[PDB]
Amino acid sequence: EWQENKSWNAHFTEHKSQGVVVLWNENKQQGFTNNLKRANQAFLPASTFKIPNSLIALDLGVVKDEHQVFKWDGQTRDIATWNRDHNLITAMKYSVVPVYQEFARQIGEARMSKMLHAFDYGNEDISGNVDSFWLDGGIRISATEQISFLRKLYHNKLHVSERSQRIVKQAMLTEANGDYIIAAKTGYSTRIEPKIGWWVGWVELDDNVWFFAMNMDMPTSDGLGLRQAITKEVLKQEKIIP
Amino acid sequence: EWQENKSWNAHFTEHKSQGVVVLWNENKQQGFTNNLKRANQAFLPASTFKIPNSLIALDLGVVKDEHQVFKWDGQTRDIATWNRDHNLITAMKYSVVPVYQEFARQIGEARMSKMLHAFDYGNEDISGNVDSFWLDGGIRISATEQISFLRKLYHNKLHVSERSQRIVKQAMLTEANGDYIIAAKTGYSTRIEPKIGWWVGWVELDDNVWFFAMNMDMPTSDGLGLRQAITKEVLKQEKIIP
């Protein structure tokens, strides 16, 4: 149905920010957002592309399972958590780009494009570098197109093995307590303007699930925590979480 | 190697309790506990049997997936969360017995028996009723045997489809944040003495996983929260969690 709820802008305003939060009630099959336009505008997926990247790597055997280790290449990078060994779990937790760049190289241009056509993922355009097109290439995806994709993943309906889809949905685990579960992926697009931060995924409850996809103008890494803060505030406002 | 650590007993003392906490460091392959004896004593698994029960139900088609709904039977029981509809996820969260009793009935005595031999689960004895043997029957399992079973489950090495094992491990999810993930199942044996409470599962960390299995004497429902409290105290003491 897609309903606008401009009251949420106050959460962006209070932090001198601009963005969009898109919610989809799976049960009632209804959508909500503070900005219907920006909800369908396509941006670089940045590290949220690690979801489909993992799916393709797993389905193609590039990655055996989620426990396979990827030795650090010894190149000390300016993010402390990247200078370690990683599996698919932690590689996604810490948005460890160089690991997913090795994935994309082995996947290749033909298989990557062929699988994103099947996934019906964003504009399906991998133009650019095989190992960086989601950071500075031609791939583009909207917040609504993220939710549409996330619903396919949630229900194990993508053109990859169900196993691939269950492994990734495990790796997307972010937060859980007696009230809710959040499986999601953070992103930060910085190589091409406008710089934006991402958070996409869903909130699982006892009796329902709420898919969400938000992005916000993000000129500095200092405000990245607002991706979750603003999102959680909207969830409280809608009484989806305490 | 298995080393004893009776210092943890102080966490039982301060709460007027007696019990055992058994830990297994997967990476270093080392075990720790405050009481090797009680760590090898076999008790009724109670609702912790919902783990092997789910695996068997899923593998035999009794349960299609984790989203399939199981209508309330209308029999109003004295636990409010039982008097509603449930899927495999919520049924396990709330230890919804009548749902898993229906699972066991459709599974049957013969298949249930064959699968617990495959799982190598406890004394493998279903003597009694197929729909209550884990509450008042002949099945018995120790805290170490729990860990041994949980280790096989974690690595997808039980004699059932990997799919079942990935679904159940999703259902075991209890608590997760940026520091750790806990997948576990609570239990409460009350129909046969000694009354005890259970907590079994594992703490997943960036660089390790710690399998744990605890039981404690539980004469009253007032102390059930100590299953997690006492366990978490031992986890803090070993710097496994903050």
CSV table of C-alpha atoms in Angstrom, one decimal:
chain,number,residue,atom,x,y,z
A,1,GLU,CA,0.0,0.0,0.0
A,2,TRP,CA,3.0,2.2,0.9
A,3,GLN,CA,2.0,5.0,3.3
A,4,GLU,CA,4.0,8.1,4.1
A,5,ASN,CA,4.7,9.1,7.7
A,6,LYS,CA,6.6,12.4,7.6
A,7,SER,CA,6.6,12.6,11.4
A,8,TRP,CA,9.8,10.5,11.4
A,9,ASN,CA,11.8,13.4,9.9
A,10,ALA,CA,12.1,14.7,13.5
A,11,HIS,CA,14.5,11.8,14.2
A,12,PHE,CA,16.7,12.9,11.3
A,13,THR,CA,16.3,16.6,12.2
A,14,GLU,CA,17.4,16.3,15.8
A,15,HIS,CA,20.7,14.9,14.6
A,16,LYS,CA,21.0,17.5,11.7
A,17,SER,CA,20.8,14.7,9.2
A,18,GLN,CA,18.8,13.7,6.2
A,19,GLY,CA,17.7,10.2,5.2
A,20,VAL,CA,14.8,7.8,4.6
A,21,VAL,CA,13.5,4.9,6.7
A,22,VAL,CA,11.4,2.3,4.9
A,23,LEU,CA,9.4,-0.2,6.9
A,24,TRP,CA,7.4,-3.2,5.6
A,25,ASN,CA,4.9,-5.0,7.8
A,26,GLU,CA,5.1,-8.6,6.5
A,27,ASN,CA,1.8,-9.7,8.1
A,28,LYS,CA,-0.4,-6.7,7.0
A,29,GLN,CA,1.7,-6.4,3.8
A,30,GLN,CA,1.9,-2.6,4.1
A,31,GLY,CA,4.9,-0.2,3.8
A,32,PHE,CA,5.8,3.0,5.7
A,33,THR,CA,8.4,5.7,5.1
A,34,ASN,CA,9.1,9.4,5.8
A,35,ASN,CA,10.0,10.1,2.1
A,36,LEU,CA,8.4,8.1,-0.7
A,37,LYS,CA,10.6,9.5,-3.4
A,38,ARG,CA,14.0,8.9,-1.6
A,39,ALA,CA,12.6,5.5,-0.8
A,40,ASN,CA,12.7,4.6,-4.5
A,41,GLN,CA,15.9,6.5,-5.4
A,42,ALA,CA,18.8,4.2,-6.2
A,43,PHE,CA,22.2,4.6,-4.5
A,44,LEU,CA,25.4,2.6,-4.4
A,45,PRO,CA,24.8,-0.5,-2.1
A,46,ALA,CA,28.3,-0.2,-0.6
A,47,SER,CA,28.8,-3.0,2.0
A,48,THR,CA,25.1,-4.0,1.9
A,49,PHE,CA,26.1,-5.7,-1.3
A,50,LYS,CA,27.9,-8.2,1.0
A,51,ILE,CA,24.6,-9.9,1.3
A,52,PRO,CA,24.2,-10.9,-2.4
A,53,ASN,CA,28.0,-11.3,-2.7
A,54,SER,CA,28.0,-13.9,0.1
A,55,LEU,CA,25.0,-15.7,-1.5
A,56,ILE,CA,26.9,-15.9,-4.8
A,57,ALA,CA,30.2,-16.9,-3.3
A,58,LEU,CA,28.4,-19.7,-1.3
A,59,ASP,CA,26.3,-20.9,-4.2
A,60,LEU,CA,29.4,-21.1,-6.5
A,61,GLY,CA,31.6,-22.9,-4.0
A,62,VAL,CA,34.0,-20.0,-3.7
A,63,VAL,CA,33.2,-20.2,0.0
A,64,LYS,CA,32.8,-23.7,1.4
A,65,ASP,CA,30.9,-22.6,4.5
A,66,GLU,CA,30.7,-19.9,7.1
A,67,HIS,CA,33.6,-21.2,9.2
A,68,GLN,CA,36.2,-21.3,6.4
A,69,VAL,CA,39.1,-19.0,7.3
A,70,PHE,CA,40.5,-16.3,5.0
A,71,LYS,CA,44.1,-15.6,6.0
A,72,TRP,CA,45.0,-12.0,6.4
A,73,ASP,CA,47.0,-10.8,3.4
A,74,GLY,CA,49.5,-9.0,5.8
A,75,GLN,CA,48.7,-5.6,4.3
A,76,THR,CA,48.0,-3.4,7.3
A,77,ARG,CA,45.0,-1.3,6.6
A,78,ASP,CA,43.7,1.7,8.6
A,79,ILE,CA,40.8,-0.3,10.0
A,80,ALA,CA,42.0,-2.3,13.0
A,81,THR,CA,39.5,-5.1,12.6
A,82,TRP,CA,40.5,-5.8,9.0
A,83,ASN,CA,44.0,-6.7,9.9
A,84,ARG,CA,43.0,-10.2,11.1
A,85,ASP,CA,41.9,-13.5,9.8
A,86,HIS,CA,38.2,-13.7,9.0
A,87,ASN,CA,35.4,-16.1,8.2
A,88,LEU,CA,32.2,-15.1,6.4
A,89,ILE,CA,30.6,-14.3,9.7
A,90,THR,CA,33.1,-11.7,11.0
A,91,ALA,CA,33.9,-10.5,7.5
A,92,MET,CA,30.4,-9.3,7.3
A,93,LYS,CA,30.2,-8.1,10.9
A,94,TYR,CA,33.2,-5.8,10.3
A,95,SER,CA,32.4,-5.0,6.6
A,96,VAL,CA,35.8,-6.4,5.7
A,97,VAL,CA,36.0,-5.2,2.1
A,98,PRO,CA,39.3,-6.8,1.0
A,99,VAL,CA,37.8,-10.3,1.7
A,100,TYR,CA,34.7,-9.6,-0.4
A,101,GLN,CA,37.0,-8.2,-3.1
A,102,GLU,CA,38.7,-11.6,-3.4
A,103,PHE,CA,35.2,-13.2,-3.6
A,104,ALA,CA,34.2,-10.9,-6.5
A,105,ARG,CA,37.4,-11.6,-8.4
A,106,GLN,CA,36.9,-15.4,-8.3
A,107,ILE,CA,33.2,-15.1,-9.0
A,108,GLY,CA,34.0,-13.2,-12.2
A,109,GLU,CA,32.2,-10.6,-14.4
A,110,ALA,CA,30.0,-13.1,-16.2
A,111,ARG,CA,28.7,-15.1,-13.2
A,112,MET,CA,28.3,-12.0,-11.1
A,113,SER,CA,26.1,-10.3,-13.7
A,114,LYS,CA,24.2,-13.5,-14.4
A,115,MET,CA,23.4,-14.1,-10.7
A,116,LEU,CA,22.3,-10.5,-10.1
A,117,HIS,CA,20.0,-10.8,-13.1
A,118,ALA,CA,18.4,-13.8,-11.4
A,119,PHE,CA,18.4,-12.0,-8.0
A,120,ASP,CA,16.6,-9.1,-9.7
A,121,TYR,CA,19.0,-7.0,-7.6
A,122,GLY,CA,18.9,-3.2,-8.1
A,123,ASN,CA,19.7,-2.0,-11.6
A,124,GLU,CA,21.6,-5.4,-12.2
A,125,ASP,CA,24.5,-3.3,-13.7
A,126,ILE,CA,28.0,-4.3,-12.6
A,127,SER,CA,29.7,-1.8,-14.9
A,128,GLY,CA,33.0,-0.8,-13.4
A,129,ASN,CA,35.5,-3.0,-11.6
A,130,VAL,CA,34.7,-6.6,-10.8
A,131,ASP,CA,36.1,-6.1,-7.3
A,132,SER,CA,34.7,-2.6,-6.6
A,133,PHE,CA,31.6,-1.9,-8.7
A,134,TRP,CA,29.4,-1.8,-5.5
A,135,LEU,CA,31.6,1.0,-4.2
A,136,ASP,CA,32.3,3.1,-7.3
A,137,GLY,CA,30.7,1.3,-10.2
A,138,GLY,CA,27.3,1.2,-12.0
A,139,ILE,CA,25.3,-0.9,-9.6
A,140,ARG,CA,22.4,1.0,-7.9
A,141,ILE,CA,19.6,0.0,-5.6
A,142,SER,CA,16.8,1.8,-3.7
A,143,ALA,CA,15.6,1.2,-0.2
A,144,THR,CA,12.4,-0.4,-1.5
A,145,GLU,CA,14.4,-2.6,-3.9
A,146,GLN,CA,16.4,-3.7,-0.9
A,147,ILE,CA,13.3,-4.7,1.0
A,148,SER,CA,11.9,-6.5,-2.0
A,149,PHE,CA,15.2,-8.4,-2.2
A,150,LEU,CA,15.4,-9.0,1.5
A,151,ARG,CA,11.9,-10.6,1.4
A,152,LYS,CA,13.0,-13.0,-1.3
A,153,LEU,CA,16.0,-14.0,0.9
A,154,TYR,CA,13.9,-14.3,4.1
A,155,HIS,CA,11.6,-16.8,2.4
A,156,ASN,CA,14.4,-18.8,0.8
A,157,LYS,CA,13.1,-17.9,-2.7
A,158,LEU,CA,16.3,-16.5,-4.4
A,159,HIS,CA,17.8,-18.4,-7.4
A,160,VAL,CA,20.5,-20.0,-5.1
A,161,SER,CA,20.6,-22.9,-2.8
A,162,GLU,CA,18.4,-22.7,0.3
A,163,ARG,CA,21.6,-23.5,2.2
A,164,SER,CA,23.3,-20.3,0.8
A,165,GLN,CA,20.3,-18.3,1.9
A,166,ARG,CA,20.3,-19.8,5.4
A,167,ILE,CA,24.0,-19.2,5.9
A,168,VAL,CA,23.8,-15.6,4.9
A,169,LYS,CA,20.7,-15.0,7.1
A,170,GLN,CA,22.7,-16.4,10.0
A,171,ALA,CA,25.7,-14.1,9.2
A,172,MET,CA,23.3,-11.1,9.1
A,173,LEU,CA,22.5,-11.6,12.8
A,174,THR,CA,23.1,-8.3,14.5
A,175,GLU,CA,21.1,-8.1,17.8
A,176,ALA,CA,18.7,-10.3,19.7
A,177,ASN,CA,16.9,-10.5,23.1
A,178,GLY,CA,13.6,-11.8,24.5
A,179,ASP,CA,11.8,-9.0,22.6
A,180,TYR,CA,13.1,-9.2,19.1
A,181,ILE,CA,15.7,-10.3,16.6
A,182,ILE,CA,17.5,-8.0,14.2
A,183,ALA,CA,19.3,-9.5,11.2
A,184,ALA,CA,20.7,-6.6,9.1
A,185,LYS,CA,23.8,-5.3,7.2
A,186,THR,CA,25.4,-1.9,7.6
A,187,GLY,CA,26.8,0.1,4.7
A,188,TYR,CA,28.7,3.3,4.0
A,189,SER,CA,29.0,4.7,0.4
A,190,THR,CA,31.9,7.2,0.3
A,191,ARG,CA,33.6,6.9,-3.1
A,192,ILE,CA,30.8,8.6,-5.0
A,193,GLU,CA,28.5,11.5,-3.8
A,194,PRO,CA,26.2,11.7,-2.0
A,195,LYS,CA,28.0,9.9,0.9
A,196,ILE,CA,25.3,7.8,2.6
A,197,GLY,CA,25.1,5.2,5.4
A,198,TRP,CA,22.9,2.1,5.0
A,199,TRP,CA,21.1,-0.2,7.3
A,200,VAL,CA,18.9,-2.9,5.8
A,201,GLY,CA,17.4,-6.1,7.1
A,202,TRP,CA,14.4,-7.0,9.3
A,203,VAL,CA,13.1,-7.2,12.8
A,204,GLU,CA,11.7,-10.6,13.7
A,205,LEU,CA,9.1,-10.7,16.5
A,206,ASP,CA,7.0,-13.5,18.0
A,207,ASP,CA,4.1,-12.9,15.7
A,208,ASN,CA,5.4,-10.8,12.8
A,209,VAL,CA,8.5,-9.6,11.0
A,210,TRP,CA,9.3,-6.0,9.9
A,211,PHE,CA,11.6,-5.6,6.9
A,212,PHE,CA,13.5,-2.3,6.9
A,213,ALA,CA,15.9,-0.4,4.7
A,214,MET,CA,17.3,3.0,5.6
A,215,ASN,CA,19.9,5.3,4.2
A,216,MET,CA,21.0,8.8,5.4
A,217,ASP,CA,23.4,11.5,4.3
A,218,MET,CA,26.7,10.6,6.0
A,219,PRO,CA,29.6,13.1,5.4
A,220,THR,CA,31.8,11.6,8.2
A,221,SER,CA,32.3,8.2,9.7
A,222,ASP,CA,31.7,9.9,13.1
A,223,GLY,CA,27.9,9.8,12.6
A,224,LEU,CA,27.6,6.2,11.5
A,225,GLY,CA,26.0,5.2,14.8
A,226,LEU,CA,23.0,7.2,13.8
A,227,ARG,CA,22.1,4.5,11.2
A,228,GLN,CA,21.0,2.3,14.1
A,229,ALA,CA,20.0,5.0,16.5
A,230,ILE,CA,17.6,6.7,14.1
A,231,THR,CA,16.2,3.4,12.9
A,232,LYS,CA,15.6,2.1,16.5
A,233,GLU,CA,13.9,5.4,17.4
A,234,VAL,CA,11.4,4.9,14.6
A,235,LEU,CA,10.8,1.3,15.8
A,236,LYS,CA,10.1,2.6,19.3
A,237,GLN,CA,7.7,5.2,17.8
A,238,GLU,CA,5.8,2.5,16.0
A,239,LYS,CA,5.8,0.3,19.2
A,240,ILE,CA,7.6,-2.4,17.2
A,241,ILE,CA,10.2,-2.6,20.0
A,242,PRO,CA,10.3,-1.3,23.6
B,1,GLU,CA,41.6,-32.7,28.8
B,2,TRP,CA,38.9,-31.7,31.2
B,3,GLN,CA,40.0,-29.7,34.3
B,4,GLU,CA,38.0,-28.9,37.3
B,5,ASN,CA,37.3,-25.4,38.6
B,6,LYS,CA,35.5,-25.6,41.9
B,7,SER,CA,35.8,-21.8,42.4
B,8,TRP,CA,32.6,-21.4,40.4
B,9,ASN,CA,30.6,-23.1,43.2
B,10,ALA,CA,30.6,-19.7,44.9
B,11,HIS,CA,28.1,-18.6,42.3
B,12,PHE,CA,25.8,-21.4,43.3
B,13,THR,CA,26.4,-20.7,47.0
B,14,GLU,CA,25.5,-17.0,46.9
B,15,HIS,CA,22.1,-18.0,45.4
B,16,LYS,CA,21.5,-21.0,47.9
B,17,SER,CA,21.9,-23.4,45.0
B,18,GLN,CA,23.7,-26.6,43.9
B,19,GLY,CA,24.5,-27.4,40.3
B,20,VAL,CA,27.1,-27.9,37.6
B,21,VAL,CA,28.3,-25.7,34.8
B,22,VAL,CA,30.3,-27.4,32.0
B,23,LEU,CA,32.2,-25.4,29.4
B,24,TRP,CA,34.0,-26.5,26.3
B,25,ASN,CA,36.5,-24.3,24.5
B,26,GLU,CA,36.1,-25.4,20.9
B,27,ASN,CA,39.3,-23.9,19.6
B,28,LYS,CA,41.7,-25.2,22.2
B,29,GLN,CA,39.5,-28.3,22.7
B,30,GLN,CA,39.6,-28.1,26.5
B,31,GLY,CA,36.8,-28.6,29.0
B,32,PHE,CA,36.1,-26.9,32.4
B,33,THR,CA,33.6,-27.4,35.1
B,34,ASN,CA,33.0,-26.9,38.9
B,35,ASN,CA,32.0,-30.6,39.4
B,36,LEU,CA,33.2,-33.4,37.1
B,37,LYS,CA,30.8,-35.8,38.8
B,38,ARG,CA,27.5,-34.0,38.4
B,39,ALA,CA,28.9,-33.0,34.9
B,40,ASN,CA,28.6,-36.7,34.0
B,41,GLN,CA,25.4,-37.5,35.9
B,42,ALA,CA,22.4,-38.2,33.6
B,43,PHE,CA,19.1,-36.4,34.2
B,44,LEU,CA,15.9,-36.0,32.3
B,45,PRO,CA,16.5,-33.5,29.5
B,46,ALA,CA,13.1,-31.9,30.0
B,47,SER,CA,12.4,-29.2,27.5
B,48,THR,CA,16.1,-29.3,26.3
B,49,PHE,CA,14.9,-32.3,24.4
B,50,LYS,CA,13.1,-29.8,22.1
B,51,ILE,CA,16.4,-29.7,20.2
B,52,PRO,CA,16.6,-33.3,19.0
B,53,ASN,CA,12.8,-33.3,18.8
B,54,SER,CA,12.9,-30.4,16.3
B,55,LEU,CA,15.7,-32.0,14.2
B,56,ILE,CA,13.7,-35.2,14.0
B,57,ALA,CA,10.4,-33.5,13.2
B,58,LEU,CA,12.0,-31.4,10.5
B,59,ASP,CA,13.9,-34.3,8.9
B,60,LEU,CA,10.8,-36.5,8.8
B,61,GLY,CA,8.6,-33.8,7.3
B,62,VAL,CA,6.5,-33.6,10.5
B,63,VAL,CA,7.4,-29.9,10.4
B,64,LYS,CA,7.8,-28.3,7.0
B,65,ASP,CA,9.9,-25.3,8.1
B,66,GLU,CA,10.3,-22.8,10.9
B,67,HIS,CA,7.4,-20.7,9.8
B,68,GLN,CA,4.7,-23.3,9.6
B,69,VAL,CA,1.9,-22.5,12.1
B,70,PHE,CA,0.5,-24.9,14.7
B,71,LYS,CA,-2.9,-23.8,15.9
B,72,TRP,CA,-3.7,-23.8,19.6
B,73,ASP,CA,-5.8,-26.9,20.5
B,74,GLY,CA,-8.2,-24.8,22.7
B,75,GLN,CA,-7.2,-26.6,25.9
B,76,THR,CA,-6.5,-23.7,28.2
B,77,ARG,CA,-3.3,-24.5,30.2
B,78,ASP,CA,-1.8,-22.6,33.2
B,79,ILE,CA,1.0,-21.1,31.1
B,80,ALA,CA,-0.4,-18.1,29.1
B,81,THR,CA,2.1,-18.3,26.3
B,82,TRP,CA,1.0,-21.8,25.5
B,83,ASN,CA,-2.6,-20.8,24.8
B,84,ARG,CA,-1.9,-19.3,21.4
B,85,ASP,CA,-0.6,-20.3,18.0
B,86,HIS,CA,3.1,-21.0,17.5
B,87,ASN,CA,5.7,-21.9,14.9
B,88,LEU,CA,8.9,-23.9,15.6
B,89,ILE,CA,10.7,-20.7,16.7
B,90,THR,CA,8.1,-19.5,19.3
B,91,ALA,CA,7.3,-23.0,20.4
B,92,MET,CA,10.9,-23.5,21.5
B,93,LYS,CA,11.3,-20.0,22.9
B,94,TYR,CA,8.4,-20.6,25.4
B,95,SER,CA,9.0,-24.4,25.9
B,96,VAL,CA,5.5,-25.0,24.5
B,97,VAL,CA,5.2,-28.7,25.5
B,98,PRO,CA,1.9,-29.7,23.8
B,99,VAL,CA,3.3,-28.6,20.4
B,100,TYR,CA,6.3,-30.9,20.8
B,101,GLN,CA,4.1,-33.6,22.2
B,102,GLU,CA,2.2,-33.6,18.9
B,103,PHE,CA,5.5,-33.7,17.0
B,104,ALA,CA,6.6,-36.8,19.0
B,105,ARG,CA,3.3,-38.6,18.3
B,106,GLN,CA,3.5,-38.1,14.6
B,107,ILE,CA,7.3,-39.0,14.7
B,108,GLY,CA,6.3,-42.2,16.4
B,109,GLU,CA,8.1,-44.7,18.8
B,110,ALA,CA,10.1,-46.5,16.1
B,111,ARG,CA,11.5,-43.5,14.3
B,112,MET,CA,12.1,-41.6,17.5
B,113,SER,CA,14.1,-44.5,18.8
B,114,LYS,CA,16.2,-44.9,15.6
B,115,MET,CA,17.0,-41.2,15.5
B,116,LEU,CA,18.3,-41.0,19.1
B,117,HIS,CA,20.6,-43.9,18.4
B,118,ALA,CA,21.9,-42.0,15.3
B,119,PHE,CA,22.3,-38.8,17.4
B,120,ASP,CA,24.1,-40.9,20.0
B,121,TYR,CA,21.8,-38.9,22.4
B,122,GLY,CA,22.0,-39.8,26.1
B,123,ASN,CA,20.9,-43.3,27.1
B,124,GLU,CA,18.9,-43.4,23.9
B,125,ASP,CA,15.9,-44.8,26.0
B,126,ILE,CA,12.4,-43.6,25.0
B,127,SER,CA,10.7,-46.1,27.4
B,128,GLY,CA,7.4,-44.6,28.5
B,129,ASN,CA,5.2,-42.5,26.3
B,130,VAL,CA,6.6,-41.2,23.1
B,131,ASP,CA,5.0,-37.8,23.9
B,132,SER,CA,6.3,-37.4,27.5
B,133,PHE,CA,9.4,-39.6,27.9
B,134,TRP,CA,11.6,-36.6,28.1
B,135,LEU,CA,9.5,-35.3,31.0
B,136,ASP,CA,8.7,-38.5,33.0
B,137,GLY,CA,10.2,-41.4,31.0
B,138,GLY,CA,13.5,-43.3,30.7
B,139,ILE,CA,15.6,-40.9,28.6
B,140,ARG,CA,18.6,-39.6,30.4
B,141,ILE,CA,21.5,-37.4,29.4
B,142,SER,CA,24.4,-35.7,31.1
B,143,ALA,CA,25.8,-32.2,30.8
B,144,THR,CA,28.9,-33.6,29.0
B,145,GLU,CA,26.7,-35.7,26.7
B,146,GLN,CA,24.7,-32.5,26.0
B,147,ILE,CA,27.9,-30.7,24.9
B,148,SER,CA,28.9,-33.7,22.8
B,149,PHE,CA,25.5,-33.5,21.1
B,150,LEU,CA,25.6,-29.7,20.7
B,151,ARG,CA,29.1,-29.9,19.2
B,152,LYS,CA,27.9,-32.4,16.5
B,153,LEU,CA,24.9,-30.1,15.9
B,154,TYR,CA,27.1,-26.9,15.5
B,155,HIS,CA,29.3,-28.5,12.9
B,156,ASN,CA,26.3,-30.0,11.0
B,157,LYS,CA,27.6,-33.6,11.8
B,158,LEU,CA,24.4,-35.2,13.2
B,159,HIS,CA,22.9,-37.9,11.1
B,160,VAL,CA,20.2,-35.6,9.7
B,161,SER,CA,20.0,-33.1,6.9
B,162,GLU,CA,22.2,-30.0,7.2
B,163,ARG,CA,19.0,-28.1,6.6
B,164,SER,CA,17.4,-29.4,9.8
B,165,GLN,CA,20.5,-28.5,11.7
B,166,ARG,CA,20.6,-25.0,10.4
B,167,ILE,CA,16.9,-24.5,11.2
B,168,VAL,CA,17.2,-25.7,14.7
B,169,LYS,CA,20.3,-23.6,15.4
B,170,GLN,CA,18.3,-20.6,14.2
B,171,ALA,CA,15.5,-21.5,16.7
B,172,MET,CA,18.0,-21.8,19.6
B,173,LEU,CA,18.8,-18.1,19.2
B,174,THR,CA,18.3,-16.5,22.6
B,175,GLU,CA,20.6,-13.4,22.9
B,176,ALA,CA,23.1,-11.7,20.6
B,177,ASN,CA,24.9,-8.3,20.4
B,178,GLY,CA,28.2,-7.0,19.1
B,179,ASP,CA,30.0,-9.0,21.8
B,180,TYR,CA,28.6,-12.5,21.5
B,181,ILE,CA,25.8,-14.7,20.3
B,182,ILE,CA,24.0,-17.2,22.5
B,183,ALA,CA,22.0,-20.1,21.0
B,184,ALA,CA,20.6,-22.2,23.8
B,185,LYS,CA,17.5,-24.1,25.2
B,186,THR,CA,16.1,-24.0,28.7
B,187,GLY,CA,14.7,-26.9,30.6
B,188,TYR,CA,12.8,-27.7,33.7
B,189,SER,CA,12.4,-31.3,35.0
B,190,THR,CA,9.6,-31.4,37.6
B,191,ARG,CA,7.7,-34.7,37.1
B,192,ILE,CA,10.5,-36.8,38.6
B,193,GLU,CA,12.9,-36.0,41.4
B,194,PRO,CA,15.3,-34.5,41.7
B,195,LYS,CA,13.7,-31.3,40.2
B,196,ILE,CA,16.4,-29.5,38.2
B,197,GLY,CA,16.7,-26.7,35.7
B,198,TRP,CA,18.7,-26.9,32.5
B,199,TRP,CA,20.5,-24.4,30.2
B,200,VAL,CA,22.5,-25.8,27.2
B,201,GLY,CA,23.9,-24.2,24.1
B,202,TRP,CA,26.9,-22.2,23.2
B,203,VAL,CA,28.4,-18.7,23.2
B,204,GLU,CA,29.7,-17.7,19.7
B,205,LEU,CA,32.5,-15.1,19.7
B,206,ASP,CA,34.5,-13.5,17.0
B,207,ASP,CA,37.4,-15.9,17.3
B,208,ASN,CA,35.9,-18.9,19.2
B,209,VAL,CA,32.8,-20.7,20.4
B,210,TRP,CA,32.1,-22.0,23.9
B,211,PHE,CA,29.7,-24.8,24.3
B,212,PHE,CA,28.0,-24.9,27.7
B,213,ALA,CA,25.7,-27.2,29.6
B,214,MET,CA,24.5,-26.5,33.2
B,215,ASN,CA,21.9,-28.1,35.4
B,216,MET,CA,21.0,-27.1,39.0
B,217,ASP,CA,18.6,-28.4,41.7
B,218,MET,CA,15.3,-26.5,41.2
B,219,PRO,CA,12.7,-27.3,43.9
B,220,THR,CA,10.6,-24.2,43.1
B,221,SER,CA,9.7,-22.2,40.0
B,222,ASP,CA,11.1,-19.1,41.9
B,223,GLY,CA,14.7,-19.9,41.0
B,224,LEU,CA,14.4,-20.6,37.3
B,225,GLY,CA,16.0,-17.3,36.4
B,226,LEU,CA,19.2,-18.6,38.1
B,227,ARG,CA,19.8,-21.0,35.2
B,228,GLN,CA,20.9,-18.0,33.1
B,229,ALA,CA,22.1,-15.8,35.9
B,230,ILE,CA,24.5,-18.3,37.4
B,231,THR,CA,25.7,-19.3,33.9
B,232,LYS,CA,26.4,-15.7,32.9
B,233,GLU,CA,28.3,-15.1,36.1
B,234,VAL,CA,30.7,-17.9,35.2
B,235,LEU,CA,31.0,-16.5,31.7
B,236,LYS,CA,32.0,-13.1,33.1
B,237,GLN,CA,34.5,-14.6,35.5
B,238,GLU,CA,36.3,-16.3,32.6
B,239,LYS,CA,36.3,-13.1,30.6
B,240,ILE,CA,34.2,-15.0,27.9
B,241,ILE,CA,31.7,-12.1,27.9
B,242,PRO,CA,31.9,-8.6,29.4
